[PDB]
Each structure stands twice: as C-alpha cells, then as structure tokens.
A paper describes a structure:
Previous proteomic analysis of culture supernatants from wild-type L. pneumophila 130b strain (a clinical isolate) and a T2SS (lspF) mutant identified NttE, a 288-amino acid protein encoded by the lpw02811 ORF (lpg0189 in strain Philadelphia-1; lpp0250 in strain Paris; lpl0249 in strain Lens), as a secreted substrate of the L. pneumophila T2SS. Crystals of NttE were obtained at pH 6.5 and the structure was determined using selenium single-wavelength anomalous dispersion (Se-SAD) phasing with electron density maps refined to 2.2 Å. The final model contains two molecules in the asymmetric unit and all residues could be built except for the N-terminal His6 tags and the NttE residues Asn1 to Ala6. Each NttE protomer is formed of two domains, with the N-terminal domain (residues T20 to N143) composed of 7 α-helices and 3 β-strands, and the C-terminal domain (residues D7 to F11 and G146 to L269) formed from 5 α-helices and 4 β-strands. Two disulfide bonds are present in each chain of NttE, one in the N-terminal domain between Cys62 and Cys90, and another in the C-terminal domain between Cys259 and Cys268. The NttE dimer is mainly stabilized through β-sheet interactions provided by the C-terminal domain and the presence of this dimer in the asymmetric unit strongly indicates that NttE is a dimer in solution. The NttE α1 helix mediates hydrophobic interactions with the α4 helix in the C-terminal domain, and it appears that small changes in this interface results in large changes in the orientation of the N-terminal region. However, analysis of all known sequences of NttE homologs from Legionella species and A. siphonis revealed a conservation hotspot at the interface of the N- and C-terminal domains, positioned on the “top” face of the NttE dimer. Comparison of the two models with lowest χ2 values with the crystal structure of NttE-130b highlighted significant variability in the positioning of the N-terminal domains, although in all models the β1 strand remained tethered to the C-terminal domain. Together these data indicate that the N-terminal domains of NttE are mobile and this may be important for its function in modifying the bacterial cell surface and/or during intracellular infection.
Author numbering: 7 to 269
Write the structure that this text describes.
C-alpha cells in the first residue's frame, strides 16, 4: 500500500531503465523556495540506431552524460524511462533503436537557474547523429483522477469488491503544482481515519458533497485507490503526452486502522 508504480511495458530484446523520485513525498519547505511558475519539462525522443555499431552500454552512457546525471534528485522531481533495443541475431548484438520518455520539474529558484543554463547548453543536443534531445515545455496538465472504494478479503492479492467509483478533473500549470497541492493533500488527508480530514478531502477533490455520500461507504470499505492520470497538454493543438510511467495510491484501511475499515 501507499504509492505503487504501474508495471513497465517490457519489450522482447530491449534494455529498459526507470529512474524516478516521484515516490518521495513532496517537501513543502523545499517547494516554497520556488517563487515563480516554470513549466514541466517533457522529453519524448526516439531514434533508429541500426548501422552505427553502438552497444546498449554506449547508448546508456551517452544518455547519462547529456541528460540523466545533469538532473539531480536534490533539485528536480523526475520520472524517466530509457530503452535500447538490440539485434539478438547480430554477432555483436549492436543497439538498433532507443527512446527517452521523461517529465521533470525544478523544485526551487536555484533549480530553475540551473535548469535555464542546462537548457541553453543541451537543448537540441545531437544524439548519435540520428535525433536531437528536444526538451519541451508542457503548457499545463489535466489530472483525471479516479477514486475506487471497496472491500478486499486478501490484502496480498489484486481482486476486491468495488462498492463505488468516481472521477474528477483539474487543470494545473505544472506537475510541480500537482505535487504541491494535490499529492501533498493525499499524504496529509487521504491516509487518515479522522472523518474531519478524509471527508473534507473528498469534498475538495471528488465532488462538493462527496463527504456526505462516502461516510457510510468508508465505514463499509477496507480498501481505497486514487489513480491521478497526468495528461500533459503540449503547445500545439491536439498534442497530449501521457507517460507510460504511471503511479496510483493504494490505501489498505484493513491494516492501518484499529477497526479494519476506512472509517
């Protein structure tokens, strides 16, 4: 229970690397040291490497030198997937293709200064003379958040009795603002059996009188989930980005509360 990452799509003959600190609770003290809006940075880059005679270790090294190692978990929240396909039948098993999927946010004014300088030097960097490292500004994010409430009889397994499902939708300027407002509130109030914490959390995020509807449902339930789907809105009309890098909040009331229910 808590923040669970969704399984990686694991292709046939492909090295896959996942780097994230999105699992770490938002640090409101740190984030208060950012005094301006800055867009979430997006990387959705891919390239054919057939014929360049690169190994997967060469591809991973170049991406680490120009991207991964420049984005520190002390200055940024990031979620990054790096993949490198190789030719199983080639006597050298040379890399045939690669991709970088990332979103990341500077957490402070000093991180924003460091970022502006990283972008000036590295935005547009020639990767393997095949494609460029394009770091894009998301215009904003729409969170389409699902709530599940129900009764699970075995906490080690996936199946449960679903009692109620709700969706609500919010626009934020960045993933930074998602973490500062919604994610911090999940940690503070969604994981509470104090009715004056969780019922008002529901009034704010689910629907304005969800607190009244859910009192009886929470008393009958032992298991909640929140799935905040992050839909990044890009600058061009009709361009959305959703990272394969997904997380959800599981709340095992059965184990957290003395009475083994959500209320």
């Amino acid at each position: 229970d808590g923040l669970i990452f969704s399984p990686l799509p694991q292709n046939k003959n492909t090295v896959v690397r996942h780097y994230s600190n999105e699992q770490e609770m938002p640090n409101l003290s740190q984030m208060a040291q950012r005094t301006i809006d800055f867009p979430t940075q997006i990387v959705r880059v891919s390239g054919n490497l057939t014929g360049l005679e690169l190994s997967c270790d060469d591809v991973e090294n170049e991406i680490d030198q120009v991207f991964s190692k420049k984005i520190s978990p002390n200055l940024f929240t990031y979620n990054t997937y790096v993949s490198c396909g190789y030719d199983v039948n080639d006597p050298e098993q040379h890399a045939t293709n690669f991709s970088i999927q990332s979103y990341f946010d500077p957490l402070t004014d000093n991180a924003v200064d460091y970022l502006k300088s990283y972008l000036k030097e590295y935005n547009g960097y020639n990767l393997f003379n095949t494609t460029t490292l394009q770091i894009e500004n998301a215009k904003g994010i729409i969170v389409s958040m699902n709530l599940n409430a129900g009764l699970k009889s075995n906490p080690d397994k996936t199946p449960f009795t679903l009692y109620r499902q709700d969706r609500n939708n919010f626009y934020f300027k960045s993933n930074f603002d998602v973490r500062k407002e919604l994610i911090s509130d999940i940690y503070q109030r969604f994981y509470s059996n104090d009715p004056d914490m969780i019922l008002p959390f529901f009034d704010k995020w689910i629907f304005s009188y969800a607190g009244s509807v859910y009192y009886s449902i929470l008393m009958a339930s032992n298991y909640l989930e929140l799935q905040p789907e992050r839909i990044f809105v890009m600058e061009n009309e009709g361009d959305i980005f959703v990272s394969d890098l997904r997380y959800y909040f599981a709340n095992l009331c059965m184990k957290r509360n003395p009475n083994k229910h959500c209320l």
